[PDB]
Design a protein around this ligand. Structure first.
Ligand code: CLA
Ligand code: CLA
Ligand code: CLA
Ligand code: CLA
Ligand code: CLA
Ligand code: CLA
Ligand code: CLA
Ligand code: CLA
Ligand SMILES: CCCCCCCCCCCCCCCC(=O)OC[C@H](COP(=O)(O)OC[C@@H](O)CO)OC(=O)CCCCCCCCCCCCCCC
Ligand SMILES: CC1=C(/C=C/C(C)=C/C=C/C(C)=C/C=C/C=C(C)/C=C/C=C(C)/C=C/C2=C(C)CCCC2(C)C)C(C)(C)CCC1
Ligand code: SF4
Lengths: 39, 212, 45, 202, 738
C-alpha cells in the first residue's frame, strides 16, 4: 500500500489527476456560469 | 486462534486483535500503515455511531408511521418538518455547519495533537476534552455515567458490542436506502409485506435487484 | 438407406482405408469418411 | 490412484512441470467431485419418471427433468413453495457455505476444525487428504475399516461415478435431440430396438 | 513429445516495482539525471529482448502482453456495443435503414459543442458514425438494444477474463520455453480450433439465427414482431416454414443427401436486390466450406502420434541446384527469434487487411452497406492504412532480426545467405525499375500537364488522344463476368457487379455498378506500382544492408537504432535500418494517400450516385480529368474540399476544426524533420541560464531530444497530420454529399 501510494505519487499519475481536477473545475465553472467573456 | 472473517485464511500482519472488532478483514490492505489504520479506526467509529443514531431514528419514526400517529416516512420527513414549521432550509443547514464544524474540528485537532484540546483554551475546561484512546473520548461530558474507568474488561466487552452494533447499523442504513430505492415504500411497510408473504414478497420479486 | 449406393461407397471407403491401434483407427476412419463423402457427392454430378 | 487404469492419452497427470489447476491433486479431486455430483444427477434425472411410471408419485409431478425449472424455455413447474429465483438465492447462500468451506479444507488441510462453527468442528477435521474427509458425519458407518476394503470402495466409487458421468452426458444429449425423457428412451428402445435408435431420430 | 510445461509462481505480484520507474533496465534503474531518461523509459519499456537474454522469460512477457492487448480490445468492443445500445438510434434505423443515418455518439450540452448533435433522423440527435456497426448488427440478426447491452456485459466480462489470464500466465503459472516452441502443435490448434471452429460456430449462428431474422427483415415484418432467436432454435416448425429443408432435420447431413440443403446453402452470387448486400445463404455456405477446409488443414503436423508432417523435414526436403542448401536453418530461425515471426506475420496481416479493404468494397457483405457511401469510404480507407502500417512494421522487425538474431554459423550457404550475398544486384535492379516506373508513370502526367497548358490536347495521353487502354485488366474483367456461363456452371450470377452486368440499387442510390478501366485507370495503377516498388526498395535495402555496407562495414555492432557514424567519410546520417523504416513510413504515406484518393474519386465519379439514368456524385469527370495533376488539384482536392471548408455553423464543423488542426500538426512536424538537436540544445542552454538566474533550474537536466527521437517525433506528427487531414476531408465530403 505504501508502494501503491508511491506509484500514485509518480509524475504521470499526478499529472493525470491534477489535470483531471483542473479541467473538471473549469468545466463545472463553464456549466454553472455559461459563456463568460468579461469581468 | 481468534475467529477470522474468512475461516482458513490467516489474518494480515497489521491486524493483530488489539482492536475491537478485529477479524482480520482487510483484503485490499487499506490499513497497512499504522497512522492510516488509526485514522480509519476513528472513521469507522464515527460512521458507525452516526449509523446507529440514524437507524434508531428510521426505526422509531417508521413504527410511529405504521401505527397511526401521523409521523412521516424518513424520505419525506425533512420536507414536511421544514414546510410545517417556520423553518427556512439554508439557515438551519448553516447552523448545522457551525456546530458540527466546531465539534468536528475539535475532534480533528485532537487526532493531530493527542492531548491538546485539554489545555483550557475552550472556555475553562481541562481534562474533560482529553481523550482516553483513539476515538474513545470518555471524560465527564462524553462518558457522564462513567463506564470506561471501572471494570476495564467489561469496558473492552462494550467496545466489542459498540463496533458490532455499529457495523450492523451501517449495513442496516445501506439497507434502508436500497430498500427505498427498490420498492418506493417505508421500510417497516416492507417488513410488513415480508411478514405477509415471505415466500413471494422479496428482492427476487421486486423486479429490480435481479433483472432476469 | 441400408444397402443403398451411398452406404456401399461409404462402407467400401472405410474398409479400404482400414485395410490400407486406436490412433490408426481414428486416422484411417477420418480419411475413409472424407474419401467416401467425396466420391458420393462426386458421382452425383 | 483410485481408478488408475493407465488411460491417459493426453498426458495430463505428468508431475514434471505442472501447476495451475492441471495437477494430480486438483484433477483426481475434481474427478471425484464431478463423479459424486453426476451420480446424484443421474439418480435425480431418472427418479420422477420411474416413480410416475410405477404409480408412486402423482401425475402433477413426475415431469421430465429438463422441464423442472432448470430451463424455463424447456418448461417450468408451478407448485413449488416459491419462485425459482427465491429458491436459487437460498441455493447461492447454502452452496456458497458448503463449497467454500470445502475449498478452504483443500487449500489449508485441517483448518476447518478450529474456528467456532456451532460446535461443528470435530466433524470437519478431514484427513491428511482431500476428496475423502471421513469423520463422524462424512463416514457415518465405519465402512472401509480395512485398508484393502477402503481401496475397493474408492475404486467402486470411481467406476459408478464415471458411469454416471457418461449417463448424465447421455441425458443431456438425448434430451436435446429427441426431446423426451431417458425412461421414455428406455421404453422406446426396449419396444423397438431396430426402429428406435440414434440412426432413426436424425 | 508435446505436453504442457509450466513453472509455478515465478514472479510475485507486488506493487514494489510499480514504485521504481525503469526497474526493467539495468541502465535506467539508476534513476534520472537528465530528461533523456524519461524518453528512454518509455521507448524501451516493451523491448523485452533488451531486458533479458533468456528466451523463456521474453516469451512469457510477450504472452501476457498479448493477453493485455486482447483485454483492451474486449473493453473497446464492449464500449461500442454499450454505446450502440444506450446512446444510439439503432432501432429507428432498423425500422428505416434508407432514410436514417447511423449515429451512436452524443455530446453533452456545454461550451456550444451541442451543435455537433445533428439531425440524423429517428427522433435522435448525434454524430453520424461510419464504422459500420449498425450494418454488422443487422446482419447478425440483432434487433433490440437489450441484446447489444448483454453483448456489452459479455465483452466486459471477457476483458476481465483476459486480464486475469495475463496476470495468471505471468505471475502464477507461466509457460515454459518448450511449451512456446511447439509450433507444429500451435499450427494444428490454431488452424483447427481458431479458424476452423470459429467459422464453424459462426456458420452455426448464421444458419440458425441470421438467415431467418434477416429473411423476415427483407420480407418487411416489423423487427419487434419478428420471433426472438431462441424460439427459432426451439421450434423447428418455424424454420421449416421459412426453409422446408429444416423439416428433414440433420438426416440429409448424415445420409450425405446434402443437395436438400439448397434452401439456405446457396451459390447465387451478386447482391440481394432489395438489400444491396451479399446473400446470407451464400455467406453461410461459405463459412461451412471454410470451416471444413480449415479443420482438414489443422491435422497436418505430427504431435504426440506418428501421423502428421514435420516442419523441419518439409523445409529441409526442398533443395535445388540453384539455391544450394535451400530452406535449411529456417526452422531454427523461426522457432528462436520473435522478430522474424513478427516480420512474417506483420507482412501477411497487413497485406490481408488491404485485401479485406478491396474485397469488402467490391462485394458488400453487409445489408444497407453499399449505399452508406460514408461507411464504404471509411472502411476501405481505414483498413488500407492499417495494412500499410503493418507492412512497414514487417520491414522494421525483419531488420531487427537481421541485426540482433542473425547468426551465420548456423546459417552458412542458405537462402538468406545468398540473398545477403547478391544484395547489390537486388538493390540495383530494384533501383533501376523504380526510376523507370517513376519516369514513365509520372512523366505521362507531366507530359499531359504540358500539352494541356500549351493548347494541344490532341497530343495528350487520354481516351480521345493517344490511348493507353488496360487491355489485360479489361480481359480479366470480361472473363470474370463470363465465368458463370462456362467455368462456374453452378453460379447464378457473377461474384461481383464490378465485372459487368446490370445494376443493383437500393432506396434510389446505386449500390454497385460495372466499373470501367481506361487510360486514367492505367495511369493510376502504374503510379501505384511505382510507389509500392519504391517503398519496397527502401525497406528491403534497409533489411539487406542492416548489418554491413561498403560505407559502414561493421554497421551491425552499432545496433538497429542509431543516429549515424559521424560526419566523416563524407557523412553517414541515416545509415541505420531504423532510418530506413523512417523513410519507408513517409513513402508508405505517399503511396496509400494516392491509393485512397484513387478510390474516393473513382467511386464518386463512376459508381455512386442516385438513380432517377444514374446521376453520379461528380458527374463522371474521372475519365477525362484524372490524366493531369491540375485535374486532380482542381476537380478532386479543390472541388471536393467545399464541404469541409464550409462546414462551420453545422454538425460537421468538427471536421473543419480537425481539417485545420491536422494541417497545423503536419506543419508542426516539419520543425523536427528539418532541424537538428544541436541548435535546440544550445537554445535550451540559454533558457537554463534564465532559469538559473531565478533559482528555478530543475535537478533533472533539460536536454534536447536525441537525433533519432527528433526523427521519430517528426514522422509521427507528419503521419498524424496528413492522415487526419485526409480523414476530415473524406468524412465531411461523403457525409454532406451522401
Ligand atoms: C490563449 C488565448 C485564449 C484566451 C485569452 C481565452 C479566453 C477565454 N475563452 Mg477560449 N479558447 C482558447 C484560448 C483562449 N481562450 C483555445 C486555444 C480554445 C480551444 C481549446 C478555446 C476554446 C474555448 C471555448 C469552447 C470557450 C472558451 C471560453 C473562453 C472564456 C473563458 C472564461 C472562463 O473560463 O470563465 C472564468 C474562469 C475562471 C474565473 C477560472 C479562474 C479561477 C481563478 C481562481 C480566478 C481568479 C480571478 C481573480 C475566456 C474569454 C468560453 C467562452 O464562453 O468564451 C466567451 C468558452 O465556452 N474558449
Ligand atoms: C448501543 C451500543 C453502544 C455500545 C455498547 C457503546 C459503548 C461505548 N460507548 Mg458508544 N455510542 C453509541 C452506541 C454504543 N456505545 C452511539 C449510537 C453514539 C453516538 C451518539 C455513541 C457515542 C459515544 C461517545 C461520544 C463515547 C462513547 C463511549 C462508549 C464506551 C463507554 C460508554 C458506555 O459504556 O456506554 C454503554 C452503552 C450502552 C449501555 C448502550 C445504551 C443503549 C441505549 C440506551 C439504547 C436506546 C437508545 C435509543 C436512542 C432509544 C463504550 C465502549 C465513550 C468512550 O469511548 O469512553 C472512553 C465516549 O466518550 N460512545
Ligand atoms: C469418384 C470420383 C469423383 C468424381 C467423378 C468427382 C466429381 C466432382 N467433384 Mg469430387 N472429389 C472426389 C471424387 C470425385 N469427384 C474425391 C475422392 C475428393 C476428395 C475427398 C473430391 C473433392 C471435391 C471437392 C472439394 C469438390 C469436388 C467437386 C466435384 C465436381 C466438379 C469437379 C470440378 O470442379 O472440375 C464433380 C461433380 C467440386 C464441386 O463442385 O462439388 C459438387 C468441389 O468443390 N470434389
Ligand atoms: C487463448 C490463449 C491461451 C493459451 C494458449 C492458454 C494455455 C494454457 N493455459 Mg490458460 N487461460 C486463458 C487463455 C489461454 N491459456 C484464459 C482466457 C484464462 C482465463 C479463463 C486462462 C486461465 C487458465 C487457468 C486457471 C489455467 C490455465 C492453464 C493453461 C495451460 C494448460 C491448459 C490446458 O491445456 O488444459 C486443458 C483445458 C481445459 C481442461 C479446459 C477447456 C474447457 C474450458 C471451459 C475452456 C473452453 C474454451 C473454449 C474455446 C470455449 C468454448 C465456448 C463455447 C462452446 C460456447 C496452457 C499453458 C492451466 C495451467 O496453467 O496448467 C499448467 C491452468 O490451471 N489457463
Ligand atoms: C485450439 C485451441 C486454441 C485456440 C482457439 C487458440 C487461440 C489463440 N491463441 Mg493459441 N495456443 C494453443 C491453442 C489454441 N490457441 C496451443 C495448444 C499452444 C501451445 C502450442 C498455443 C500457444 C499460443 C501462444 C504463445 C499465443 C497464442 C495466442 C492465441 C490467440 C491469438 C489471438 C487471436 O487472433 O484470436 C482471436 C481472439 C479470440 C478468439 C478470443 C477468444 C479466446 C478464448 C480464450 C478462446 C481460446 C481458447 C483457449 C485456448 C482456451 C483457454 C482455456 C483456459 C481456461 C485453459 C488466440 C486466442 C497468442 C495470444 O494472443 O496470447 C494471448 C499468443 O501469443 N497461442
Ligand atoms: C457449429 C455450431 C452449431 C450448433 C451449436 C448447432 C446447434 C443446433 N443445430 Mg445445427 N447446423 C449447423 C451448426 C450448428 N448447429 C450447421 C453448420 C448446419 C448446416 C449443415 C446446421 C444445420 C441444422 C439443421 C437442418 C438442424 C440443426 C439443428 C440444431 C439444434 C439441434 C441439433 C442436435 O440435435 O444436436 C445433437 C445434440 C447435442 C449435441 C446435445 C448437446 C450436449 C448436451 C447439452 C450435453 C449436456 C451434458 C450435461 C452433463 C447435462 C446438463 C446438466 C446440467 C443441467 C446441470 C441445435 C441447436 C436442428 C434444429 O433444431 O433446427 C432449429 C435441425 O433441424 N442444425
Ligand atoms: C515532388 C516531390 C518529390 C520528387 C519529385 C522526388 C523524386 C524522387 N525521389 Mg524523393 N522524397 C521526397 C519527395 C520527392 N521525391 C520527400 C519529401 C522525401 C522525404 C521522406 C523523399 C525521400 C526519398 C527516398 C527515401 C527515396 C526517394 C527517391 C526519389 C527518386 C525516385 C526515382 C524516380 O522515380 O525517378 C524518376 C524521376 C521522377 C519521378 C522525377 C520527375 C521527373 C520528370 C517527370 C521528368 C524529368 C525530365 C526533366 C523535365 C528534364 C529537365 C530538363 C532541364 C534540366 C533543362 C525520385 C528522383 C528514391 C530513389 O532515389 O530510389 C530510386 C528513394 O529511395 N525520395
Ligand atoms: C517521362 C515519361 C514520358 C513519356 C513516355 C513521354 C512521351 C512522349 N512525349 Mg512527353 N514529356 C515528358 C515525359 C514523357 N513523355 C515530360 C516530363 C515533359 C515536360 C518536360 C514532356 C514534354 C513533352 C513535349 C513538349 C512533347 C512531348 C512529346 C511526347 C511524345 C513524343 C516524344 C518523342 O517523340 O520522343 C522520341 C522518342 C524517343 C527518344 C524514344 C527513346 C526511348 C526508347 C523508346 C526506349 C527504348 C528502350 C528499349 C525498350 C530497351 C531495349 C534494350 C534491348 C534492345 C537490348 C511521346 C508520346 C511530344 C508530343 O507532341 O507527343 C504527342 C512533344 O512535342 N513531351
Ligand atoms: C520470373 C521470376 C522467376 C524466378 C524463378 O523462376 O526462380 C526459380 C529458381 C529455382 O531454384 P531451385 O529450383 O534451385 O530452388 C529450390 C528451392 O530453393 C526452392 O524450392 O530460383 C532461383 O534460381 C533464384 C533466382 C532468382 C532470380 C530473380 C529474378 C527476379 C525477377 C523479378 C521480376 C518480377 C516480375 C513479376 C512480379 C510479379
Ligand atoms: C476387428 C475387431 C473388432 C471390430 C472393431 C471395429 C468394428 C472397429 C470399427 C472401427 C471404425 C468403424 C472406425 C471408424 C472411424 C470413423 C471415423 C473416426 C470418422 C470420422 C469422420 C469424420 C472426421 C468426418 C468428417 C467430415 C465432415 C464432418 C463433413 C465434411 C467432410 C468430412 C467427411 C471430412 C471387435 C472389437 C468387434 C472384435 C475384435 C476384432
Ligand atoms: S550528427 Fe546528425 S549530422 Fe552530424 S552526422 Fe550524425 S547525423 Fe549526420
Amino acid at each position: 500500500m505504501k508502494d501503491f501510494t508511491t506509484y500514485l505519487s509518480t509524475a504521470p499519475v499526478i499529472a493525470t489527476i491534477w489535470f483531471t481536477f483542473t479541467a473538471g473545475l473549469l468545466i463545472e465553472i463553464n456549466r454553472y456560469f455559461p459563456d463568460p467573456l468579461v469581468f | 486462534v481468534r475467529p477470522v472473517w474468512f475461516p482458513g485464511n490467516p489474518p494480515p500482519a497489521h491486524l493483530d486483535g488489539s482492536l475491537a472488532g478485529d477479524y482480520g478483514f482487510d483484503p485490499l490492505f487499506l490499513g497497512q500503515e499504522p497512522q492510516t489504520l488509526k485514522w480509519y479506526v476513528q472513521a469507522e467509529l464515527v460512521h458507525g455511531r452516526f449509523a446507529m443514531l440514524g437507524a434508531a431514528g428510521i426505526i422509531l419514526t417508521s413504527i410511529g408511521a405504521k401505527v397511526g400517529l401521523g409521523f412521516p416516512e424518513w424520505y419525506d420527513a425533512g420536507k414536511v418538518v421544514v414546510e410545517k414549521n417556520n423553518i427556512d432550509f439554508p439557515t438551519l443547514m448553516v447552523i448545522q455547519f457551525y456546530l458540527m464544524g466546531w465539534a468536528e474540528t475539535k475532534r480533528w485537532y485532537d487526532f493531530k495533537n493527542p492531548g491538546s484540546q485539554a489545555d483550557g483554551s475552550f472556555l475553562g475546561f481541562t481534562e474533560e476534552f482529553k481523550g482516553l484512546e483513539n476515538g474513545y473520548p470518555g471524560g465527564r461530558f462524553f462518558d457522564p455515567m462513567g463506564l470506561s474507568r471501572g471494570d476495564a474488561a467489561k469496558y473492552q466487552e462494550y467496545k466489542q458490542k459498540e463496533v458490532k452494533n455499529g457495523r450492523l447499523a451501517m449495513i442496516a442504513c445501506l439497507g434502508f436506502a436500497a430498500q427505498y430505492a427498490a420498492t418506493g415504500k417505508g421500510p417497516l411497510d416492507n417488513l410488513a409485506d415480508h411478514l405477509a408473504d415471505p415466500n413471494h414478497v422479496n428482492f427476487a420479486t421486486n423486479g429490480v435487484s435481479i433483472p432476469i | 438407406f441400408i444397402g443403398s449406393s451411398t452406404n456401399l461407397i461409404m462402407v467400401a471407403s472405410t474398409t479400404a482405408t482400414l485395410a490400407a491401434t486406436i490412433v490408426d483407427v481414428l486416422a484411417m476412419g477420418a480419411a475413409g469418411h472424407g474419401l467416401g463423402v467425396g466420391i458420393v457427392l462426386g458421382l452425383k454430378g | 490412484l483410485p481408478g488408475d487404469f493407465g488411460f491417459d492419452p493426453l498426458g495430463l497427470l505428468d508431475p514434471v512441470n505442472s501447476g495451475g489447476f492441471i495437477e494430480p491433486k486438483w484433477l483426481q479431486y475434481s474427478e471425484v467431485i464431478h463423479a459424486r455430483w453426476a451420480m446424484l444427477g443421474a439418480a435425480g434425472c431418472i427418479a420422477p419418471e420411474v416413480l410416475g411410471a410405477a404409480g408412486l408419485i402423482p401425475d402433477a409431478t413426475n415431469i421430465k427433468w429438463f422441464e423442472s425449472g432448470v430451463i424455463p424455455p424447456a418448461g417450468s413447474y408451478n407448485g413449488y413453495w416459491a419462485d425459482p429465483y427465491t429458491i436459487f438465492f437460498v441455493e447461492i447462500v447454502a452452496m456458497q457455505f458448503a463449497e467454500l468451506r470445502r475449498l478452504q479444507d483443500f487449500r489449508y488441510p485441517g483448518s476447518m476444525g478450529q474456528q467456532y462453527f456451532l460446535g461443528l468442528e470435530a466433524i470437519f477435521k478431514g484427513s491428511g487428504d482431500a476428496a475423502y474427509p471421513g469423520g463422524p458425519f462424512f463416514n457415518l458407518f465405519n465402512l472401509g475399516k480395512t485398508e484393502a476394503a477402503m481401496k475397493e470402495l474408492k475404486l467402486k466409487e470411481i467406476k459408478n461415478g464415471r458411469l454416471a458421468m457418461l449417463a448424465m452426458l447421455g441425458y443431456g444429449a438425448q434430451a436435446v435431440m429427441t426431446g423426451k425423457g431417458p425412461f421414455q428412451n428406455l421404453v422406446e428402445h426396449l419396444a423397438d430396438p431396430v426402429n428406435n435408435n440414434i440412426l432413426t431420430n436424425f | 513429445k508435446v505436453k504442457i510445461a509450466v513453472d509455478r509462481n515465478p514472479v510475485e505480484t507486488s506493487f514494489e516495482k510499480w514504485a521504481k520507474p525503469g526497474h526493467f533496465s539495468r541502465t535506467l534503474s539508476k534513476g534520472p539525471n537528465t530528461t533523456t531518461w524519461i524518453w528512454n523509459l518509455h521507448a524501451d519499456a516493451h523491448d523485452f529482448d533488451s531486458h533479458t537474454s533468456d528466451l523463456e522469460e521474453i516469451s512469457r512477457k510477450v504472452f501476457s502482453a498479448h493477453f493485455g492487448q486482447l483485454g483492451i480490445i474486449f473493453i473497446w468492443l464492449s464500449g461500442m456495443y454499450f454505446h450502440g445500445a444506450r446512446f444510439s438510434n439503432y432501432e429507428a434505423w432498423l425500422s428505416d435503414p434508407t432514410h436514417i443515418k447511423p449515429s451512436a455518439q452524443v455530446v453533452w450540452p456545454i461550451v456550444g459543442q451541442e451543435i455537433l448533435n445533428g439531425d440524423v433522423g429517428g427522433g435522435f440527435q448525434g454524430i453520424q458514425i461510419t464504422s459500420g456497426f449498425f450494418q454488422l448488427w443487422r446482419a447478425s440478426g440483432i434487433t433490440s438494444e437489450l441484446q447489444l447491452y448483454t453483448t456489452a456485459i459479455g465483452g466486459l466480462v471477457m476483458a476481465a477474463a483476459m486480464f486475469f489470464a495475463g496476470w495468471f500466465h505471468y505471475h502464477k503459472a507461466a509457460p515454459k520455453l518448450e511449451w512456446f516452441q511447439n509450433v507444429e502443435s500451435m499450427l494444428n490448434h490454431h488452424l483447427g480450433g481458431l479458424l476452423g471452429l470459429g467459422s464453424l460456430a459462426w456458420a452455426g449462428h448464421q444458419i440458425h439465427v441470421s438467415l431467418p431474422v434477416n429473411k423476415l427483415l427483407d420480407a418487411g415484418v416489423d423487427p419487434k414482431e419478428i420471433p426472438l432467436p431462441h424460439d427459432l432454435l426451439l421450434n423447428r416448425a418455424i424454420m421449416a416454414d421459412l426453409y422446408p429443408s429444416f423439416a428433414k432435420g440433420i438426416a440429409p447431413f448424415f445420409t450425405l443427401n446434402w443437395s436438400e440443403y439448397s434452401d439456405f446453402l446457396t451459390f447465387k452470387g451478386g447482391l440481394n436486390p432489395v438489400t444491396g448486400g451479399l446473400w446470407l445463404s451464400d455467406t453461410a455456405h461459405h463459412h461451412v466450406a471454410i470451416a471444413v477446409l480449415f479443420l482438414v488443414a489443422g491435422h497436418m503436423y505430427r504431435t504426440n502420434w506418428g501421423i502428421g508432417h514435420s516442419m523441419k523435414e518439409i523445409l529441409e526436403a526442398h533443395r535445388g541446384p540453384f539455391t544450394g542448401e535451400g530452406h535449411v536453418g529456417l526452422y531454427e530461425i523461426l522457432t528462436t527469434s520473435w522478430h522474424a515471426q513478427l516480420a512474417i506475420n506483420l507482412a501477411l496481416f497487413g497485406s490481408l487487411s488491404i485485401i479485406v479493404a478491396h474485397h469488402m468494397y467490391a462485394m458488400p457483405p453487409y445489408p444497407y452497406l453499399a449505399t452508406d457511401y460514408g461507411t464504404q469510404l471509411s472502411l476501405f480507407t481505414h483498413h488500407t492504412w492499417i495494412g500499410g502500417f503493418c507492412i512497414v512494421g514487417a520491414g522494421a522487425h525483419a531488420a531487427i532480426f537481421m541485426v540482433r538474431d542473425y547468426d551465420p554459423t548456423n546459417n552458412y550457404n542458405n537462402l538468406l545467405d545468398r540473398v545477403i550475398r547478391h544484395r547489390d544486384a537486388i538493390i540495383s535492379h530494384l533501383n533501376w525499375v523504380c526510376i523507370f516506373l517513376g519516369f514513365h508513370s509520372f512523366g505521362l502526367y507531366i507530359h499531359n500537364d504540358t500539352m494541356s497548358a500549351l493548347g494541344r490536347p490532341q497530343d495528350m495521353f487520354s481516351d480521345t488522344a493517344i490511348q493507353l487502354q488496360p487491355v489485360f485488366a479489361q480481359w480479366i474483367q470480361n472473363t470474370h463476368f463470363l465465368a458463370p456461363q462456362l467455368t462456374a456452371p453452378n453460379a447464378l450470377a457473377a461474384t461481383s457487379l464490378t465485372w459487368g452486368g446490370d445494376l443493383v440499387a437500393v432506396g434510389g442510390k446505386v449500390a454497385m455498378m460495372p466499373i470501367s478501366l481506361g487510360t486514367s485507370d492505367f495511369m493510376v495503377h502504374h503510379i501505384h506500382a511505382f510507389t509500392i516498388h519504391v517503398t519496397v526498395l527502401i525497406l528491403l535495402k534497409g533489411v539487406l544492408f542492416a548489418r554491413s555496407s561498403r560505407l559502414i562495414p561493421d554497421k551491425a555492432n552499432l545496433g538497429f537504432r542509431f543516429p549515424c557514424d559521424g560526419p566523416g567519410r563524407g557523412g553517414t546520417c541515416q545509415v541505420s535500418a531504423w532510418d530506413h523504416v523512417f523513410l519507408g513510413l513517409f513513402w508508405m504515406y505517399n503511396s496509400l494517400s494516392i491509393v485512397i484518393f484513387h478510390f474516393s474519386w473513382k467511386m464518386q465519379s463512376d459508381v455512386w450516385g442516385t438513380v432517377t439514368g444514374v446521376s453520379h456524385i461528380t458527374g463522371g469527370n474521372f475519365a477525362q480529368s484524372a490524366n493531369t495533376i491540375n485535374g486532380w488539384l482542381r476537380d478532386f482536392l479543390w472541388a471536393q474540399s467545399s464541404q469541409v471548408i464550409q462546414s462551420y455553423g453545422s454538425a460537421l464543423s468538427a471536421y473543419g476544426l480537425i481539417f485545420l488542426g491536422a494541417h497545423f500538426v503536419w506543419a508542426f512536424s516539419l520543425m523536427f524533420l528539418f532541424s537538428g538537436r544541436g541548435y535546440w540544445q544550445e537554445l535550451i542552454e540559454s533558457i537554463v541560464w534564465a532559469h538559473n538566474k531565478l533559482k528555478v533550474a530543475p535537478a533533472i537536466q533539460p536536454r534536447a531530444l536525441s537525433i533519432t527521437q527528433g526523427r521519430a517525433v517528426g514522422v509521427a506528427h507528419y503521419l498524424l497530420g496528413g492522415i487526419a487531414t485526409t480523414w476530415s476531408f473524406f468524412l465531411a465530403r461523403i457525409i454532406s454529399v451522401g
